Design a protein around this ligand. Structure first.
Ligand SMILES: Nc1ncnc2c1ncn2[C@@H]1O[C@H](COP(=O)(O)OP(=O)(O)O)[C@@H](O)[C@H]1O
Ligand SMILES: Nc1ncnc2c1ncn2[C@@H]1O[C@H](COP(=O)(O)OP(=O)(O)O)[C@@H](O)[C@H]1O
Ligand SMILES: Nc1ncnc2c1ncn2[C@@H]1O[C@H](COP(=O)(O)OP(=O)(O)O)[C@@H](O)[C@H]1O
Ligand SMILES: Nc1ncnc2c1ncn2[C@@H]1O[C@H](COP(=O)(O)OP(=O)(O)O)[C@@H](O)[C@H]1O
Ligand SMILES: [Mg+2]
Ligand SMILES: [Mg+2]
Ligand SMILES: [Mg+2]
Ligand SMILES: [Mg+2]
Lengths: 443, 426, 97, 426, 436, 70
C-alpha cells in the first residue's frame, strides 16, 4: 500500500562495485560527492562493526538531502532497521525528551533469532471425532496423506479442540504445527459432494503436497531492541507495544537488557543487526537533546545517526547565541558533515523527466523544456508539483499528451513563492500585518 | 566479529602499586596527573568509609573526561555500581527532578545479600481441594514421592496455568510461583498427535534447598516496598496495573529501608558496596538541581559522585546573573574537588591515533599515519578518530588491506569538518 | 472487520511465541504481602469481611489473558535451548554435525 | 541506623551548659558562641511548647556552619520530637501544589502522642489440643517463669491459631483485644513473670499522618508512596477539631517540633505569601531558615530583597548572624574533623591544613584530609606527613586555582556565546 | 496552651449600640475599623444578601488578619468561615477557576435535620420461619424472622423482613451479640458481644461491648450542618457500591475534578425543594482571601463573575501594597493590586497606623496572655524598640526575653534581659546594615 | 499509537486490498487558519508531506508578512 510520494522515484543510491556513483541510476541524479559519501556510510553500516558514528547532511533547501536519506534506506533494504523521525516528534508530553530519544535509539537495533520447527503438511483423507454427550471425554483420529505416503494419527484433547475450532473438512489441504498447534487451511482438494449450500465456493483447487509428511522448516524472528525493552519493562508492556504510553522505563531495566543481549550475542543464540536512524530538521532539537546525543553515541549498542539540517548559523534553541549549523559545537566536533550543492540545469531537466516517468505523465519536448526553465527560475519542487497539475489539465482537454499550453495554464493558475510575495507587497493593505491593521472595506 | 565504540580501547588506569602512572598503560596516553588523582579517588571509594564525596573533572572538549570515567568504572570492576548520566536525563516528566536525582543516588549504592531458595519440582499424581480453598497435590521425583498442601493463591496459579494430573510443576516457596515445565515423558505415547511438550521426570528428591547470592540496590528495595512487581494471581495483576506511573518516594520509606539494611548488615546476612555516580554535561543542570545536590552531598548515606564539566565562566542555567567557574554555583563548588585535565600535543595525538587503528584492526602506512596525525593536529583529534572507519572502508574498495595516503586524502575531500562547513556557509 | 480489527486480547493471544521468547527479566526485589496489602484484602484491613470475600471470589472467577506475561516475568525458567547453549562444546558439536 | 561517614557526623549536640552558655568545644561544635546561644534559646522555646509560629533565620557567609548549627539543634532536641529538614527544591512538585506541599511540611513537624492500652499474653508454650465439632473444642497451655495453666479457646482464637500454625516449645504473644499473634523464637530468652500483662504502647504520629490515614480507603499507603494528592480542606478541619477534642479529653498530647528549610532562596513569592499566614495559626511549628546570599532578586519577583525574602516575612522573623571562623577556630575544627575521619595528622601537617583552609575554604581542606589519607596509604605510612598534604594540594585543585587556569586559557573552553578553539594548532 | 499571633483577640469589643470600647476583646485602637467590622458582622448575621464584597486595606502589620479572625470569632461556630491565602488557588489538578468556585461554595452552610429510628440491643432469639404453604414462595421460601433484643429497660420481640434477615446473615450475628438496626434504611450493624458474656471463654478474640442503655427502640432527631460543597463532593465521588470496580475506584487517589455546572444546578434544585418544605435552612457564611495581591488576572475576573451568582458568601480581602502591577498583566497599575473593575465592586475599609501608647498597650496585653511578667522600664524599652523598627519585632521578642529571664530564675523580665535578647536576635534594618 | 500498530494496520489493509474486496479513497484534509500552527507542527508537516500515504492538504491564510509562530 503506497502512493507516488516526493521520494517514490528513488530505489537506492545507484553505485558501482567500487563505490563510484553512476551519473544517473536507481532514480538518483548527480550529487556525486554526497552519494559517494553515502555509499561509504552504507558499506560501514553493512559491515556492522563501527558503532555510534554521527554524520550530518548539510546544504541548501531542495538539494536532495532527504532524497539522499531515502536512497540510503533503500540501499539498506529489508532486515536492516531504518527509523526516520523528525525533530518535532521528540518534544512529547508523556515521556521525557531523553526518554523519547532513548526509545528512538533502541528502535534502531534489530535482533534476529532463527528457530527450526517441525511441520506436518498433508491432504486430509478423513477425520473422526467421538465426543460424549454431557461428558468431557472426546476421542478422535486423523488420516493425512502426501503424494508418496499416507499416515493415520490419533488425536489428543488439545489437537481435537484446535481441529474442531478450525472446522477442518476432508476436502481441505492443511498444515499441522506440532509445537504451536495452529491449523492453517492451505486450500481445497475436491468439491463438497454438492450439498445444497456452499455450492461452488471451492473451485480454487490446490495440488497435493509432496515429500515427507513431517518436514523441518526454519523460522526467523526479527525484533527491535525497543520492543524487547517494552516487553520486559512491566507486565502490561506488551499492550503498550501497540497502545503506547510505555511510561519512563527505569534505567536498571535498560542496563540488565544490555547485559543480557551481550550474553546472547556472545553465546550465538541471537544475531544483532544494527541499522540507521535518520533525524529530520535536527535544529528543532533542544540543547538538552544534543547533550544526551553526545553520550548516547558513545554506547556500544548505538546505531549510526544521520542528521539533516540546512538553517546555517542560527540561534540554538534554549540559548541566546547563534551556532554554526544550529547545533552546538559539542555535537559538531564529534560529527562528520557531508555537504550538498545546488543543481545544474541538466540535472534538473533529467530529474523532471524521471519524475514524469514515475508519475506516468507524457511530456512533450517543448513542454519539458518550459517546465525545466520554470524549475531553474524558481524551484525544483514547484515544477515537480506543476507536472501533475499539467497532466490533469491535459486530461480535462481530452488529450493523451501534455503540451506547452497545459504547462502555461498551470503556471497561470498556480503561483510560486516569489509571485505571491510580489502580489502581497503590491497589495499590503489587503492582508493583516504584524501590527494588526488591515483595510477590509474597499471605499 | 566484534563492534567498536568511542572507548573500546580503554581498559584501565594503568597505575602501579605505588600509585604513580606510567606514560602509556591501560590504553591511556599522557594526563598522568589526572590519572594519579583518579587512582587516589579510587582508593577513597574502595575504602568504603566516606559518603557524599564529589569531585569535578574540569577541562576543554576532547580532553578525556568520559574516558577517565569509563576507565574508573572498568578498574573498580563489575561488582561496584557505576552510573553515568547526562543532566538532561534528570528533567523527567512523570516525577519531579528531585525524585529522579534521589532515585539515581540510591541506585548507585549497592547491597549484596545471601538468600536460601527452597525448590519443589515434581510430576503430579493427585489433585484434591480441601473444601477458594486449599488444594492437595501429590508429587513424585526420581528419588521418591511427596504430597503437598498449598495456599489458595497457589491453587489459583495452578488452575490458571492449565495444570493437569500427570504434569510436571515447579514451585518456588519464597515467591509462591507455579510454572508448568511440561508433560511427563512417561506419557509420550499416550497419543499420536497432540500439542503436548514432553519433559523427562525431574532428577533427585522432590524438595531441594540451595543458597544463592544476589546483588540488589537500595532503589530496587524501594520499588519492591512501594508497588507490587510480580505474581501470577489476578490480584497481583490489578495491584500492579493500578497506579502505573512513578511516585515521589517519601523520606520515611527511605528511612525504613535504611533501618532494614542496617538490621541485615548487623545480622551478617547483607554487605554494603558503596559505588559511584557519574553526571556528565553538568552545565545542563538548573540551579534547583545544584541546590538540592548541595543537600544530598551532606547526606550520611551517599555514593562517591563525580562531576564532569567543560564550560568556563558560563552563566548557570535558570539563573540570569550568576557567573560561575563552570556553571556550578559557588555553594556546590565548595563541595567539590577540581581535577584539571589538559589538552594534547602532537606526539600524544599520533600515539592515540596509532592505538585506535590497532584496536579497530586497521593497517596504516607510516606516512599516511603521519598525515592523519598532522591533520588532526590542524583541526581536531576526534575528526581524525571518526575518519578512520571511512578510510578503512575506502581501502577495502581498492582491494587493498593497508591504509595509504591516497585513502586519507580522498576521505578528507569527501567528508568535511565543522570549521570547513562554517566557512562554506559564510 | 473481525480480521481487520483485532483487539488487544486477541493480539496477546496470537503472539504467544514472541512473548515466550523475549520475556527474560525478572524483578530484582519483591515483597509478597504488598500484593494483597495494596488492594486492602488483608485479614486486618478496613474493608469488610463479606465485601473482601466477594472481591476475592470475583477475582478467582474472572479470566485474564495476560497470565502468561505474569508467569514469564515471575521466574526466569530456562528452556530446552539452553542444553544446546550452556555447553560451548555442544555448540561446536552441533555446527560440525 | 547504620551509615557511612558524612561531613556532619561529628555533631552530637549543641554543647550548652545549664546557664545556656556554650563551651568553646563540646559535642562537636566549636566557637560560634552567639549563634549557639541563639540556637539554644530556640531549642528551649521548642521544648517549652508555649510559643507557636516563630521563624528564625540563620545569616552570614556561606560555609559558616548554618547547616551545622541546624543539625546541632536537631540532635540536641533529641528523638520523640519532630524535626523536619527539607530543601526548598523539594517543594516544587508536579503532583503536589506548592501551597499543599508547604502545608504538609508544616503539619509533619507537629507530633501527637496517643496512648493505647492493650491486653496481651506473653508466654512460653505447652501443648495444644484442637478438636472437631462434638463449634470447636480446644485447649492450650502456657508456661511462664512461675505459672503453667490451661486456657480454653473459642471459635475465632482456634481459627487464628490454626492459621498461624503455632508449634510447641517456642514463644508466642497473643493480644486479647486486637487478636494479633506474634511469633517468637525458642527459649537465650524466657517469660519473666505473669502470663497476662497490662502494658501501654505509645504511638507517635503527626497531623499529616492522621490526615493521610483518614484521607482514603487505604490512605496509609500514601505515607510511603508519596502519592497523597491534594487533600480536601474539610478533611484537615475535621482532623484539627478532633485533635482539639482529644487534647481536651487528655487522651493524647501534642509535641510541637521544628521545621527547617535549608535553601529558602529557592521558594517563590507565592510560597512566602503562604508561609506568612501559616506561621500565625495555632498548631504551627517553629521554622528555621538559612540563607547565605546578601541581597538578591527573589524568585518569582523582578526586584531585589534584603535577604532573598520579602520584607513581610522579614518583619515576621528574627535573624541569627554568623561570623566567619578565625584561624584558631579553623585549626580546631580541622582537628575534630580529622579525629572523626580516623586520620592521624602531624603537627606541621595540621598547621599547613589550617592555613590552606583559611586561604581557600574549610570544606576544601576537609575533603583534602581523606585524599591525603588515601595518598599516604599508597606509601604504606600510618602518620600523614607534609609531603602527602602537598601532593594532595597539587593533584586536586580549589576553586580559585581552577578559575585562574580557565581564565588564562579561555580560548580552549566554551564561552557564553558558544565559541571554542578545539584546534590545538593555530 | 500555645500562643498564636491572634490568640489575644477575643472579640470585636462593641457595645449594644455599635460603639466600640477603647480596649475590649483584645483590641487596641482602630476605632473606625472596628465600627466598620461591626457593621459588616451585623450584615452577615442578617443573612439576606449575596455577593457583597469588602476589602480590608492597609499596610503590613496593621491588623487585617486580626480583624478577619476577630470577625470569625464574633460570628460564632454556627456561621461558616473559610480562611484562605491567595497562593493556594494555583492547583495542578484543575484550573484555578474551579478551585475558587469550590472554596467559594464551601462558605454556604446548610443545616438539615433528620429524625431516625433505630433498633438496638442484645439478641436473645432468632427463629426464622417459612411460609405457611410451600407454594407460597420461591426456593427457600423464607418468611419473616423473629428477633429478641434486650436493653437496660426491658426486652422487645421484633418481626423483621427477609431482607433484614439477609442483612443479619451478612453481618454474622449470633445469640448474645449486640446489634443495631435502622428502620430508616434497613441497615444492620454488629456492635459486638455483650459484656455479660465477657468471661464465657478465658481466651477469645471478641470485642465485648456493654448492653445498650435506654429503650430497645429509641427515636432521635439528628441535626447536622453540611456545606453545599459537601453535597457536590458526595454526588461527584459517591462512596456507595461493593463491587470490585467500586473497590478499585476506592483505592484510587481522590483527585479534584471540574464538577460541572449541571451538578450544582441539580443540587440547588434539591436544596431549594427541601428548604421549601422547611426541613433545612441555608446559612451564607464568609469567605476570607488573605493576600489578594497575589491573585492572577484570571482569578480576579472569575471573582468578578462569581459575585453575580444567586448564592454567594461575603468575600473579605486583604492587601498590603499600593499602586502595584497586577500579576499576569504587563501594564495595568492598580490601586491595591486589584483590577479597577473589581475595585469598583469593593468597599475599602482603611486601617490606620498606631502611636506609641497603642504599641505600649498591645505589648502589655501580649505579655499578659503569654504568662510573662514585664518590668515597666523594660516595657518602655520594648515599646521604643517597636516604634523604632516594628511592632511585630517586639511582639515576637517578648518570648526570648521570657526564656532568658527564666534561665536567670527571675519572675519578671528585666531591662538587661531585653538588651541581651536584642544582642542575640537582630532585625531587618540591622541585618541589612550589618550585611553592608 | 506506536509505529508498529500503524504498520500492522497498513499491512492488513494491503492484504485485503490485494484480495480485491477493498478500495482506497485519499480524501482531503483542510486546515483553516494555518497561521495558528507552531514551527514544530510546520516541521512535522514538512516530514509528513513526504509520507508514502498522505491526503491532499488544503490550507488557508488571511495574513500578510508576519513572524511565523515558534
Ligand atoms: N540528486 C537527486 N536525484 C534525484 N532526485 C532528487 C535529487 N535531489 C532531489 N531530488 C528530488 O527533489 C525533491 C526535493 O528534494 P529534497 O530531498 O526534498 O530536498 P531537501 O532534502 O533539501 O528538502 C524530492 O522529490 C527529491 O526526491
Ligand atoms: N588520553 C587519551 N588516550 C586515548 N584516547 C583518548 C584520550 N582522550 C580521548 N580519547 C578518545 O577520544 C574521545 C574523546 O574523549 P572524551 O572523554 O569524550 O573528551 P571529553 O569528555 O573531555 O569531551 C574518547 O572517547 C576516546 O575515544
Ligand atoms: N562551629 C563548627 N564546629 C565544627 N564544625 C563546623 C562548624 N561550623 C561548620 N562546621 C563544618 O564545616 C562545614 C560547613 O558547615 P555548613 O553548615 O555546611 O556551612 P553553611 O551551612 O554555612 O553552608 C561542615 O562540614 C560543618 O560540619
Ligand atoms: N487593634 C489591635 N489591638 C491589639 N492588638 C492588635 C491590634 N491590631 C493588631 N494587633 C496585633 O498585632 C498584629 C498585627 O496584625 P496583623 O493582622 O498580623 O497584621 P497584618 O496586616 O500584617 O496581617 C496582630 O497579629 C495582633 O497580634
Ligand atoms: Mg528534504
Ligand atoms: Mg566528553
Ligand atoms: Mg549553609
Ligand atoms: Mg499580616
Amino acid at each position: 500500500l503506497s502512493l507516488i510520494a516526493a521520494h517514490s522515484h528513488i530505489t537506492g543510491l545507484g553505485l558501482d562495485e567500487n563505490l563510484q556513483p553512476r551519473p544517473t541510476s536507481e532514480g538518483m541524479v548527480g550529487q556525486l560527492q554526497a552519494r559517494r559519501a553515502a555509499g561509504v556510510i552504507l558499506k560501514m553500516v553493512q559491515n556492522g562493526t563501527i558503532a555510534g558514528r554521527a554524520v550530518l547532511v548539510a546544504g541548501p533547501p531542495s538539494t536532495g538531502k532527504t532524497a539522499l536519506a531515502m536512497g540510503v534506506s533503500q540501499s539498506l533494504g529489508k532486515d536492516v532497521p531504518f527509523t526516520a523521525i523528525a525533530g518535532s516528534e521528540i518534544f512529547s508530553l508523556e515521556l521525557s525528551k531523553t526518554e523519547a530519544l532513548t526509545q528512538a535509539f533502541r528502535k534502531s537495533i534489530g535482533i534476529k533469532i532463527k528457530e527450526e520447527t517441525e511441520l506436518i503438511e498433508g491432504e486430509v483423507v478423513e477425520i473422526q471425532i467421538d465426543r460424549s454427550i454431557t461428558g468431557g471425554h472426546k476421542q478422535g483420529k486423523l488420516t493425512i496423506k502426501t503424494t508418496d505416503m499416507e499416515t493415520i494419527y490419533e488425536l489428543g484433547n488439545k489437537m481435537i479442540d484446535g481441529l474442531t475450532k478450525e472446522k477442518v473438512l476432508a476436502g481441505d489441504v492443511i498444515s499441522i504445527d506440532k509445537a504451536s498447534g495452529k491449523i492453517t487451511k492451505l486450500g481445497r482438494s475436491f468439491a463438497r459432494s454438492r450439498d445444497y449450500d456452499a455450492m461452488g465456493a471451492d473451485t480454487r483447487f490446490v495440488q497435493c503436497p509432496e515429500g515427507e509428511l513431517q518436514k523441518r522448516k526454519t523460522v526467523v524472528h526479527t525484533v527491535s531492541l525497543h520492543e524487547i525493552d517494552v516487553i520486559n519493562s512491566r507486565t502490561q508492556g506488551f499492550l503498550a507495544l501497540f497502545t503506547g504510553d510505555t511510561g519512563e522505563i527505569r534505567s536498571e531495566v535498560r542496563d540488565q537488557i544490555n547485559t543480557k543481549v551481550a550474553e546472547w550475542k556472545e553465546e550465538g543464540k541471537a544475531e544483532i543487526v544494527p541499522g540507521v536512524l535518520f533525524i529530520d530538521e535536527v535544529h528543532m532539537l533542544d540543547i538538552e537533546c544534543f547533550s544526551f546525543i553526545n553520550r548516547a553515541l558513545e554506547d556500544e549498542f548505538a546505531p549510526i545517526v544521520m542528521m539533516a539540517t540546512n538553517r546555517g548559523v542560527s540561534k540554538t534553541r534554549g540559548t541566546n547565541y547563534k551556532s554554526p549549523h544550529g547545533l552546538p559545537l559539542d555535537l559538531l566536533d564529534r560529527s562528520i558533515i557531508i555537504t550538498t550543492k545546488s543543481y545544474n540545469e541538466q540535472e534538473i531537466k533529467t530529474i523532471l523527466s524521471i519524475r514524469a516517468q514515475e508519475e506516468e505523465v507524457e511530456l512533450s519536448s517543448d513542454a519539458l523544456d518550459l517546465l525545466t526553465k520554470t524549475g531553474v527560475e524558481t524551484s525544483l519542487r514547484y515544477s515537480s508539483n506543476l507536472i501533475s497539475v499539467a497532466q490533469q489539465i491535459a486530461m480535462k482537454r481530452k488529450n493523451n499528451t501534455v503540451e506547452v499550453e497545459d504547462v502555461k495554464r498551470a503556471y497561470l493558475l498556480f503561483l510560486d513563492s516569489a509571485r505571491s510575495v510580489k502580489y502581497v507587497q503590491e497589495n499590503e493593505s489587503q492582508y493583516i500585518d504584524d501590527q494588526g491593521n488591515v483595510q477590509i472595506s474597499i471605499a | 566479529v566484534t563492534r567498536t565504540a568511542a572507548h573500546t580501547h580503554i581498559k584501565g588506569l594503568g597505575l602501579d602499586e605505588s600509585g604513580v602512572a606510567k606514560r602509556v598503560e591501560g590504553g591511556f596516553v599522557g594526563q598522568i596527573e589526572a590519572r594519579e588523582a583518579c587512582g587516589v579517588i579510587v582508593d577513597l571509594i574502595k575504602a568504603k568509609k566516606m559518603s557524599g564525596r564529589a569531585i569535578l573533572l574540569a577541562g576543554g572538549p576532547s580532553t578525556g573526561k568520559t574516558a577517565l570515567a569509563l576507565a574508573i568504572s572498568q578498574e573498580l570492576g563489575p561488582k561496584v555500581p557505576f552510573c553515568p548520566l547526562v543532566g538532561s536525563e534528570l528533567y523527567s516528566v512523570e516525577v519531579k527532578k528531585t525524585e529522579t536525582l534521589m532515585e539515581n543516588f540510591r541506585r548507585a549504592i549497592g547491597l549484596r545479600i545471601k538468600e536460601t531458595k527452597e525448590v519443589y519440582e515434581g510430576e503430579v499424581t493427585e489433585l484434591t481441594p480441601e473444601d477458594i480453598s486449599h488444594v492437595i497435590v501429590g508429587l513424585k521425583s526420581a528419588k521418591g514421592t511427596k504430597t503437598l498442601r498449598l495456599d489458595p493463591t497457589i491453587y489459583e496459579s495452578i488452575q490458571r496455568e492449565k495444570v493437569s494430573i500427570g504434569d510436571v510443576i515447579y514451585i518456588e516457596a519464597n515467591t509462591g510461583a507455579v510454572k508448568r515445565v511440561g508433560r511427563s515423558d512417561a506419557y509420550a505415547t499416550e497419543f499420536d498427535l497432540e500439542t503436548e511438550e514432553y519433559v523427562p521426570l525431574p532428577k533427585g528428591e522432590v524438595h531441594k534447598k540451595k543458597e544463592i547470592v544476589q546483588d540488589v540496590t537500595l532503589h530496587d528495595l524501594d520499588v519492591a516496598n512501594a508497588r507490587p512487581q510480580g505474581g501470577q494471581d489476578v490480584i497481583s495483576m490489578m495491584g500492579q496495573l493500578l497506579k502505573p506511573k512513578k511516585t515521589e518516594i517519601t523520606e520515611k520509606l527511605r528511612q525504613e529501608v535504611n533501618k532494614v539494611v542496617a538490621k541485615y548488615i548487623d545480622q551478617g546476612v547483607a554487605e554494603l558496596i558503596p559505588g559511584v555516580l557519574f553526571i556528565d554535561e553538568v552545565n545542563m543542570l538548573d540551579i534547583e538541581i545544584f541546590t538540592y545536590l548541595n543537600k544530598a552531598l551532606e547526606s550520611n548515606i551517599a555514593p562517591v559522585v563525580v562531576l564532569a564539566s567543560n564550560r568556563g565562566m558560563t552563566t548557570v542555567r535558570g539563573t540570569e546573573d550568576v557567573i560561575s567557574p563552570h556553571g556550578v554555583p559557588p555553594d556546590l563548588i565548595d563541595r567539590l574537588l577540581i581535577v584539571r585535565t589538559l589538552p594534547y600535543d602532537k606526539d600524544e595525538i599520533r600515539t592515540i591515533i596509532e592505538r585506535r587503528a590497532t584496536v579497530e584492526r586497521l593497517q596504516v602506512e607510516s606516512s599516511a599515519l603521519d598525515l592523519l596525525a598532522t591533520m588532526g593536529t590542524e583541526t581536531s583529534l576526534r575528526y581524525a578518530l571518526q575518519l578512520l572507519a571511512p578510510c578503512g572502508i575506502l581501502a577495502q574498495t581498492s582491494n587493498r588491506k593497508e591504509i595509504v595516503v591516497n585513502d586519507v586524502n580522498e576521505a578528507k575531500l569527501l567528508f568535511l569538518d565543522a570549521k570547513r562547513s562554517t566557512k562554506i556557509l559564510e | 472487520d473481525n480480521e481487520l480489527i483485532k483487539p488487544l486480547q486477541t493480539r496477546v493471544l496470537d503472539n504467544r511465541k514472541i512473548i515466550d521468547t523475549f520475556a527474560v527479566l525478572t524483578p530484582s526485589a519483591v515483597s509478597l504481602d504488598m500484593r494483597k496489602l495494596a488492594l486492602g484484602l488483608n485479614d486486618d484491613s478496613s474493608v469488610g469481611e463479606n465485601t473482601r470475600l466477594k472481591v476475592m471470589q470475583n477475582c478467582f472467577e474472572v479470566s485474564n489473558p495476560l497470565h502468561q506475561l505474569q508467569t514469564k516475568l515471575t521466574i526466569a525458567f530456562p528452556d530446552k535451548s539452553l542444553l544446546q547453549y550452556d555447553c560451548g562444546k555442544l555448540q561446536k558439536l552441533a555446527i560440525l554435525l
